[PDB]
Amino acid sequence: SMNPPPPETSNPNKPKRQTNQLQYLLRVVLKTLWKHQFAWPFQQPVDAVKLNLPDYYKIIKTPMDMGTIKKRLENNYYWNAQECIQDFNTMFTNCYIYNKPGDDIVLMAEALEKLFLQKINELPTEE
Ligand SMILES: COc1nc2c(cc1-c1c(C)noc1C)ncc1[nH]c(=O)n(-c3ccccc3OC(F)(F)F)c12
DSSP states (O other), X not given: OOSXXXXXXXXXXXXXXXXXXXXXXXXXXXXXXXXXXXXXXXXXXXOTTTTTOTTHHHHOSSOOOHHHHHHHHHTTOOSSHHHHHHHHHHHXXXXXXXXXXXXXXXXXXXXXXXXXXXXXXXXXXXX
């Protein structure tokens, strides 16, 4: 019982939108990171039960992962690119806060973040 509900990926009361920046975030940015060799620990919510991390959700109150982001993009959950970018940043930050510098998972997150920033640097202008 000790995992919280995952972050919502749909909401009938949240306005939905399709922009070329959000299309780019799904088709280029997420795609790039999703299939990367270090992606797998970030492809779903942290299962603190299975991973035996009892203190995870005592420390991390704003969980986020790429599985959630991918679904949010696919479901047109975001109104703009900044909402999505914020979620990626939350994911990386959680990893850096909970784990110690130099830990393998931190190195993995840093590699993904470097790639993320490279791709966001080339975010296209709005149509
Ligand atoms: C260590 O952080 C995470 N590990 C996850 C994991 C999530 C994390 C994680 C993240 C991301 N941010 O904080 C933590 C903790 N999800 C699944 C999974 N399966 C698995 O065997 N592992 C795993 C377990 C122990 C040591 C390393 C592990 O993965 C790693 F090599 F990639 F680092 C994980």
